[PDB]
């Protein structure tokens, strides 16, 4: 909702409450999953060509008792945009690989989980410096590219570490050395085609015997396709990764091949059914694991839109992973899940 628009400054205050419940034989995901998100997007006109902006988004879980608080910052960044040249922003933001993979992250509840948060340059993460050029100086409609740098996020401070520390340090599964990446997308009418590449130094804390997938750098290569017209949405992405994909709590995959596909239709009366397939196939994993499925599921669901502010959905994760030693060791969910959600948003 735009709550302020005066003398060239605009402020949009937005959010949602998702009354949400999971049904699953897996009791670690089963039960109340209610949550809310809040955010703001602000923009200020500096000149006719130059605009400054900032965005912040926060998630607060609504499913805990009052003696605890489970909340986090999704994004927080400030930036400058110049008409027909580009933009730059810095902060917690999305990695440029997400420019392509976001195209299949459109499912009612699940999806978008061949990668995670704080996972090199694949999704949300800290310390992104992002440069973007839209429409190639305004001379090629629909063509966009981006180049991104990520600074090191290392070991926690004040915990007796003698190397690799940063002020905002964290556990090794969520660390990263310096990284660089890029994306190109082209959209003509309904069609879209895109590609992205990322390369991040891996830290010493990540390259210990306690984690599978030791390596100097984490690399990702992504291609994507999209069709979005005539009430039909189709998209697919394929990603090859090296020492970049987490294998639950075990560490990372030496190599992984990720694939996601989605098909959706929008009825006039407000119903939007969705069908999707995701898989992540790991190779040469180490410790005798050899080749294993990290993720494999079919997602069938539907959303009903009452209007732009109220909707309800059901999403059914038909989980094709089988319960074995590998998935047990990594703590990967192999059970089906049904989600039922009712969402108010502004």
């Amino acid at each position: 909702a735009e709550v302020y628009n005066k003398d060239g400054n605009k402020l949009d205050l937005y959010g949602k409450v998702d009354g949400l419940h999971y049904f699953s034989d897996n009791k670690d995901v089963d039960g109340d999953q209610t949550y809310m998100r809040l955010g703001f997007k602000g923009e200020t006109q500096v000149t006719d060509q130059l605009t400054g902006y900032g965005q912040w988004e926060y998630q607060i879980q609504g499913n805990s008792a009052e003696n605890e608080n489970n909340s986090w910052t999704r994004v927080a960044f400030a930036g400058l945009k110049f008409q027909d040249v580009g933009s730059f922003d810095y902060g917690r933001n999305y990695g440029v690989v997400y420019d392509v993979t976001s195209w299949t992250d459109v499912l009612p509840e699940f999806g978008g989980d061949t990668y995670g948060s704080d996972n090199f340059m694949q999704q949300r993460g800290n310390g992104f410096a992002t440069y973007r050029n839209t429409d190639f100086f305004g001379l090629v409609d629909g063509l966009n590219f981006a180049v991104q740098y990520q600074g090191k996020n290392g070991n926690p401070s004040g915990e007796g570490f003698t190397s690799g520390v940063t002020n905002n340090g964290r556990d090794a599964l969520r660390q990263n050395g310096d990284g660089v990446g890029g994306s190109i997308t082209y959209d003509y009418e309904g069609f879209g085609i895109g590609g992205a590449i990322s390369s991040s130094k891996r830290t010493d804390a990540q390259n210990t015997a306690a984690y599978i997938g030791n390596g100097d750098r984490a690399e990702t290569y992504t291609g994507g396709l999209k069709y979005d017209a005539n009430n039909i949405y189709l998209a697919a992405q394929y990603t090859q990764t090296y020492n970049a994909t987490r294998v639950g709590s075990l560490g990372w995959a030496n190599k992984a091949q990720n694939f996601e596909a989605v098909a959706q239709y929008q009825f006039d009366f407000g119903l939007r059914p969705s069908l999707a397939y995701l898989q992540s196939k790991g190779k040469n994993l180490g410790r005798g694991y050899d080749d294993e499925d990290i993720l494999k599921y079919v997602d069938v669901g539907a959303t009903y839109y009452f209007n732009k502010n109220m909707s309800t959905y059901v999403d059914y994760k038909i989980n094709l992973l089988d319960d074995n030693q590998f998935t047990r060791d990594a703590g990967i969910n192999t059970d089906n899940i049904v989600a039922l959600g009712l969402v108010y948003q502004f």
């Binding site: 930036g79 400058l80 945009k81 110049f82 008409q83 027909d84 040249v85 580009g86 933009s87 730059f88 922003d89 992002t130 440069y131 973007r132 050029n133 839209t134 429409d135 190639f136 100086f137 305004g138 001379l139 090629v140 966009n144 590219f145 981006a146 180049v147 890029g182």
Partner: protein
């Protein structure tokens, strides 16, 4: 009373001029919109440059200056220290040394600086620089001779923090000892200290521009770099300690005589060549038509050959007082024209890619100095006795 440099500066300033250049160049066409968070990767564009120069011949109105100022000029203006304004025309330039010569059009009552003997310079010697740092005018700064190279670039601490490489370097007697330059090419601006071409070299390079049209510096016509470059690795070069040949220039002596990218020169006339640098500098101590035999490396290849005038120092629309890129050819064997352009004002006049001009519109044109000496005396009827090898036509 108290000591001061003002008394000699008053005898020097009348020789220092200001220079305003106006000209254009080819820039790429901006692609919009502009996204500052997107690290990417033809039309003439006017630009303005400004620098200093030194009057070196009061009668002819000859002013020495940096090539990074007048390069690509369409219009070059000069303003004396007393405020009189004049127009100037290119007479010569040499990108290597970053030194250029110009001529005030219609000089009247000028003062020229006296040039001192560079060879007598010593490190603790006092130095004074005069230039136009930030455009705001003519600034003088003082200091001493820091390093005497020993090419003898002079090093001095009389520079300027963040400013553009001015011009004159003068001793305590008001005599010219060097012209300050910019070793931060296609930039202007210093590294922290000052670099000047020594006055004796300035005198020498300058006379050549006058009496020939350009400086007699022969090129081996190869182009390349060190053995660290991505191409020396991406192509894996055996025995690395020399100059990497990235390409042999077209219609060159290196090309003509024999050589191909990859070979790493190891010597020049018996002497070791450990870096493109060493080589680029050594070939610069040899005037056209010279013969220099060098050893290459492929498996063990070596040849001998003779080089021709370089292509960096060339002329354009200043040979024919009119308006329109030639250069000299070998010894006094006429003036050979090079790469013609797209607007084709001169090609349109029956001048191809390799057309010599031994006919001074009637007489002898062994060189651009002479040729231009005629297209300035008789601006009436002009018939260019050009002969591009065979065809000996006579265009107007």
């Amino acid at each position: 009373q108290m000591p001061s440099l003002a008394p000699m500066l008053e005898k020097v300033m009348p020789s220092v001029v200001s220079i305003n250049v106006e000209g254009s160049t080819t820039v790429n066409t901006p692609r919009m919109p502009r996204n500052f968070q997107q690290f990417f990767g033809g039309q003439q564009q006017k630009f303005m440059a400004l620098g200093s120069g030194v009057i070196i011949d009061a009668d002819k109105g000859y002013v020495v200056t940096n090539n990074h100022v007048v390069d690509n000029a369409t219009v070059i203006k000069v303003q004396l220290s007393d405020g009189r304004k004049f127009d100037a025309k290119m007479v010569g330039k040499d990108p290597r040394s970053d030194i250029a010569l110009i001529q005030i059009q219609n000089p009247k009552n000028l003062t020229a600086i006296k040039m001192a003997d560079s060879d007598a310079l010593r490190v603790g010697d006092y130095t004074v620089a005069i230039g136009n740092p930030f455009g705001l005018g003519e600034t003088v700064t003082s200091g001493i001779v820091s390093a005497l190279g020993r090419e003898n670039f002079i090093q001095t601490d009389a520079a300027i923090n963040r400013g553009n490489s001015g011009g004159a370097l003068v001793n305590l007697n008001g005599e010219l000892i060097g012209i300050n330059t910019a070793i931060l090419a296609p930039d202007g601006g210093n590294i922290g200290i000052g670099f000047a071409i020594p006055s004796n070299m300035v005198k020498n390079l300058t006379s050549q521009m006058v009496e020939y049209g350009q400086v007699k510096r022969g090129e081996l016509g190869i182009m390349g770099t060190e053995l660290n470059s991505e191409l020396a690795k991406a192509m894996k070069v055996d025995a690395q300690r020399g100059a990497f040949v990235s390409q042999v220039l077209p219609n060159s002596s290196a090309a003509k005589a024999g050589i191909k990218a990859g070979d790493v020169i190891t010597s020049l006339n018996g002497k070791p060549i450990s870096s493109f640098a060493a080589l680029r500098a050594q070939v610069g101590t040899m005037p056209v038509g010279s013969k220099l035999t060098l050893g290459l490396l492929r498996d063990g290849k070596q040849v001998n050959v003779n080089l021709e005038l370089q292509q960096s120092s060339q002329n354009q629309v200043d040979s024919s007082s009119i308006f329109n890129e030639m250069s000299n050819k070998g010894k006094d064997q006429g003036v050979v024209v090079n790469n013609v352009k797209t607007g084709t004002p001169a090609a349109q006049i029956g001048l191809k890619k390799g057309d010599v001009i031994i006919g001074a519109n009637q007489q002898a044109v062994k060189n651009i100095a002479e040729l231009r000496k005629v297209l300035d005396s008789k601006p009436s009827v002009l018939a260019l006795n050009i002969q591009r090898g065979d065809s000996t036509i006579y265009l107007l």
